[PDB]
Design a protein around this ligand. Structure first.
Ligand SMILES: *[C@@H]1O[C@H](CO)[C@@H](O)[C@H](O)[C@H]1NC(C)=O
Lengths: 53, 147, 49, 117, 262, 49, 109, 49, 48, 53, 49
């Protein structure tokens, strides 16, 4: 049996998404594009952080 | 301890992967042809279908968003009660409803979706044509969760 | 700092519940279906659905 | 007056089947269960199982979880006992009995089965 | 004073880990943990009562806990609290405990029964006391300077924080029913029982003496104990008595805050 | 999804396919372990390290 | 396999009280065994006498009663007469199945 | 009576087509796609532990 | 939702309070009686 | 490290020590320290308490 | 007869293959009956004659 994380806070801008994260223990974040080129990335999160994509 | 990320997280085109047995699900490439055969008992003769004599069109609102953001009102005169089909004669406009019910002298309402800034299209209802036109405004939200 | 207050749940078997709105800050209500609770002596209520 | 009526005697050969009836009268049939007991010649009684008249689902004892089959006829107020694939060891006397609370009050008149080659 | 605990009783609840990696129902269970102080003192709430006997008298060497359908007595010397290395207990009253602890990632409680059996329960937690001043230090020195901070106070007087008590719900016990030849027997054992069986239509009611139901299996029947004379706290782990609650009284939370120098 | 199958529902025949693309995400060699698939060029039999 | 042990026969005189005992070979008899007593008619017919330890069948006269004595189940009959010279049986229920006894014969002289 | 159409490979969007036969009234159909699956052929080489 | 000023009050004696935290209820687990939820943590604690 | 020991029949103790490296593996995409109350299930393996042949 | 196998006999290692041609005598569709193999274009399933 394994746990699940809590919801983030999302705001919208023109052709971008901004997210705020509230981690409790190390967690993994990854994302990819749909289509011909996926452009994969990956990183670990251990503290409160803000990202823009 | 050093294997890295698997195919489910790196594969292109948005595919999904399961392993018992090994399969790939919902990859978006190409197109599929289809062939269909219809028996003769499913049709209705033209003498039995109702006829429509007078047509008009009026559109009170339009916003060219990714959802169904139009409304239209059509007036008609019908010979007797029955069913009828609706279909668009242009490629830039889609209509949701497939069938309508008609009786006497009344009006019906439909909804549509489009990406054109200035709208001009035709509608067919049981072998008749009508012309509509309007001006449309843009939306205000940036990002949605559906195509 | 702030505090969260949670009262004891209400379980109604062989029926359906409903709740009304209130004016307290950050009020929330929901109703779920398909529950079947257990205690230390056995099941709580006779109906299994 | 409550009375239980069973079938008469019959003589069988190996490989055949025999049907034993038990007629009920004087009480409502669906309110109490029907019980069966077997008494071998020269031996005591043996318990075989009972059937619920309200639902018709039977329960069998360990020694007889085999060819034996129970049945009921609600409209006729009669219970049946069926034994299949008879052998020479199957000769015995059978009775049907009712269960009223924890007590076995009443008894049937009995039926005699004789099997020989 | 202890007069506020006169007509109450303990209860049982759910615990996510009981020592070996499996869940259980235990006489000792955990509520929220409070860490509002700047000195690093913790406050804990549990499901048993410390310092009061089973006849409603005060005795500081005893505690009472809930056995099956009846409370009983036990020793205080078996109470322990540990996260990583062991902690140290500074004061107890009723449902509440004070402790000082090292750093760690878990928390555990336990005690010993009246037949020589132990019980435990474990919850996740994250413990890291704050930093006061411009240096990080590990113990109290002999030559230094004084700066403000805050703590908890060892007092049991009445305060302004309160919690409520309500009427308990029914308890389903299966063991009471037995199976006999074509019949089901319900045993009372001195307590009021509510029953319902689906065989033969329906049969409902209350009883105080032995009773027998005809033409029914052990299944398709239900039993519960439905009369009580005491009040109990309304935990979010226990179902409600009725659509609207019935208040009976309230009790207070000890150990308020204050200013000190450290 | 090829021209070699027909089904009949309510007296109507349907034929689906063939597809217009032959793209597949797998290579010639794959390795499987409890729900995960990887692309890997494993060493030949009798030539370990 | 549990069996119930009963005495071969008992001899008494008219007007006396007759008590019969039975006991299983696997343990003591308790309130949960629901001991049963039935009587065999000389015409090879059977009728029940005592059911569920201490409940007398309806229509059975006041001289019949039963109870448990120590580890043994007992059936006591008062006012014995020559009409009581029949066969008596003892039955016990343990777990899934019943257990039947060996029977006894009553002699009144 | 035969009719041929072409639909793009996208899941969850309905499409419409028109059937017109002289002597009879026109009829309109609607279709929607729910799943597409691909499955290769495999052969085993060796195992490790 | 998660920064300085999520909960505001005009004076320590007042009774009215403003709050803008997120609160969403979630499904209970099978065989358990409990009330799970999800919520943003305090902004005052983070600022310290 | 790892250590084992026991007590004799004359009240004398014994011990023995060996080096070792203990680090349990990670299941899922998060690192956790205890067993939660609300979550998800994933496959895993263990030892069975049976004394059969 | 491909480059992914190695054998050792009397302390010598041999590797054989791959072949220079891909010619095969079988077509896409075959039929088998009690020891004979035929090349045949059988009709679609659900479209018999
Ligand atoms: C001391 O406590 C009082 C209330 O108990 C509070 O108003 C005051 O701010 C505190 N002083 C300091 C220096 O923290």
């Amino acid at each position: 049996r394994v746990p699940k994380a809590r919801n983030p806070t999302v705001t919208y801008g023109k052709n971008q998404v901004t997210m705020l994260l509230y981690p409790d223990h190390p967690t993994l974040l990854s994302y990819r594009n749909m289509g011909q080129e996926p452009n994969y990335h990956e990183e670990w999160v251990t503290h409160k952080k803000e990202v823009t994509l | 301890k050093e294997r890295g990320a698997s195919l489910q997280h790196t594969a292109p085109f948005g595919c999904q992967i399961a392993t018992n047995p090994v399969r790939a699900v919902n990859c978006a490439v190409g197109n599929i042809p289809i062939s269909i055969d219809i028996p003769d008992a499913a049709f209705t003769r033209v003498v039995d279908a109702p006829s429509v004599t007078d047509m008009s069109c009026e559109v009170p609102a339009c916003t060219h968003s990714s959802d169904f953001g139009g409304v239209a009102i059509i007036k008609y005169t019908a010979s007797k009660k029955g069913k009828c089909a609706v279909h668009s004669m242009t490629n830039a406009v889609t209509i949701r409803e497939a069938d309508v019910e008609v009786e006497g002298n009344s009006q019906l309402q439909i909804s549509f979706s489009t990406a054109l800034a200035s709208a001009e299209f035709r509608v067919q209802v049981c072998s008749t044509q009508v012309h509509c036109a309007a001006a449309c405004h843009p939306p205000k939200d940036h990002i949605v969760n559906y195509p | 700092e702030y505090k969260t207050v949670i009262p004891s749940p209400y379980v109604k078997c062989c029926g359906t519940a409903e709740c009304k709105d209130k004016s307290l800050p950050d009020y929330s209500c929901k109703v779920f279906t398909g529950v079947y609770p257990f205690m230390w002596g056995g099941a709580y209520c006779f109906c299994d659905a | 007056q409550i009375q239980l009526v069973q079938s008469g005697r019959e003589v069988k050969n190996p490989g055949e089947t025999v049907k034993i009836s038990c007629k009920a009268s004087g009480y409502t049939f669906t309110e109490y269960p029907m019980l069966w007991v077997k008494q071998a010649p020269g031996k005591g009684f043996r318990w075989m199982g009972l059937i619920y008249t309200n639902t018709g689902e039977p329960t069998y004892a360990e020694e007889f979880k085999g060819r034996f089959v129970f049945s009921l006829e609600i409209s006729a107020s009669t219970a049946y006992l069926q034994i299949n694939n008879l052998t020479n060891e199957d000769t015995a006397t059978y009775f049907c009995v009712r269960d009223y609370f924890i007590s076995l009050d009443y008894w049937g008149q009995g039926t005699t089965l004789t099997v020989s080659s | 004073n202890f007069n506020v605990y006169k007509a109450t009783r303990p209860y049982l609840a759910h615990c996510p880990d009981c020592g070996e990696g499996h869940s259980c129902h235990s006489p000792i269970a955990l509520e929220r943990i409070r860490n509002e102080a700047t000195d690093g003192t913790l406050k804990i709430q549990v499901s048993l009562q410390i310092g009061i006997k089973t006849d409603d008298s005060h005795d500081w060497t005893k505690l009472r806990y809930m056995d099956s359908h009846t409370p009983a007595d036990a020793e205080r010397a078996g109470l322990l609290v540990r996260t990583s290395a062991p902690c140290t207990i500074t004061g107890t009253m009723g449902h509440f405990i004070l402790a000082r602890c090292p750093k760690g990632e878990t928390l555990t409680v336990g005690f010993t029964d009246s037949r020589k059996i132990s019980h435990t329960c474990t919850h996740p937690f994250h413990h890291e006391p704050p930093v006061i001043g411009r240096e990080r230090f590990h113990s109290r020195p002999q030559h230094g300077k004084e700066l403000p901070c805050s703590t908890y106070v060892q007092s049991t007087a009445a305060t302004a924080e309160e919690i409520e008590v309500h009427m308990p719900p029914d308890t389903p016990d299966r063991t009471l029913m037995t199976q006999q030849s074509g019949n089901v027997k319900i045993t009372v054992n001195g307590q009021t029982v509510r029953y319902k069986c689906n065989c033969g239509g329906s049969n409902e009611g209350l009883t105080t003496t032995d009773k027998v139901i005809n033409n029914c299996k052990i299944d398709q029947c239900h039993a519960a104990v439905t009369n009580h004379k005491n009040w109990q706290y309304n935990s979010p782990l226990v179902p409600r008595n009725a659509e609207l609650g019935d208040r009976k009284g309230k009790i207070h939370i000890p150990f308020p805050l204050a200013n000190v120098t450290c | 999804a090829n021209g070699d199958h027909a089904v009949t529902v309510k007296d109507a025949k349907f034929v689906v396919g063939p597809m217009s693309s032959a793209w597949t995400p797998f290579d010639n060699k794959i390795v499987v372990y409890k729900g995960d698939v990887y692309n890997m060029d494993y060493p030949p039999f009798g030539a370990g390290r | 396999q549990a069996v119930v042990t009963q005495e071969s026969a008992l001899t008494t005189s008219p007007g006396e009280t007759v008590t019969l005992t039975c006991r299983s070979n696997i343990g003591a008899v308790t309130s949960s065994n629901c001991a049963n007593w039935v009587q065999e008619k000389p015409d090879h017919f059977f009728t029940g006498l005592i059911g569920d330890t201490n409940n007398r069948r309806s229509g059975v006269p006041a001289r019949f009663s039963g109870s448990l004595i120590g580890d043994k189940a007992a059936l006591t009959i008062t006012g014995a007469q020559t009409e009581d010279e029949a066969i008596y049986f003892c039955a016990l229920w343990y777990n899934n199945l019943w257990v039947f006894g060996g029977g006894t014969k009553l002699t009144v002289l | 009576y035969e009719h041929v159409t072409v639909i793009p490979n996208t899941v969850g969007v309905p499409y419409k087509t028109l059937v017109n036969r002289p002597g009879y009234s026109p009829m309109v159909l609607e279709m929607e796609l729910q799943s597409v699956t691909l499955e290769p052929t495999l052969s085993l080489d060796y195992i490790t532990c | 939702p998660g920064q300085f000023g999520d909960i505001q009050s005009r004076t320590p004696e007042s009774k009215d309070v403003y709050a803008n935290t997120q609160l969403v209820l979630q499904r209970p687990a099978a065989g358990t009686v409990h009330v799970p939820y999800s919520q943003a943590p305090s902004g005052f604690k983070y600022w310290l």
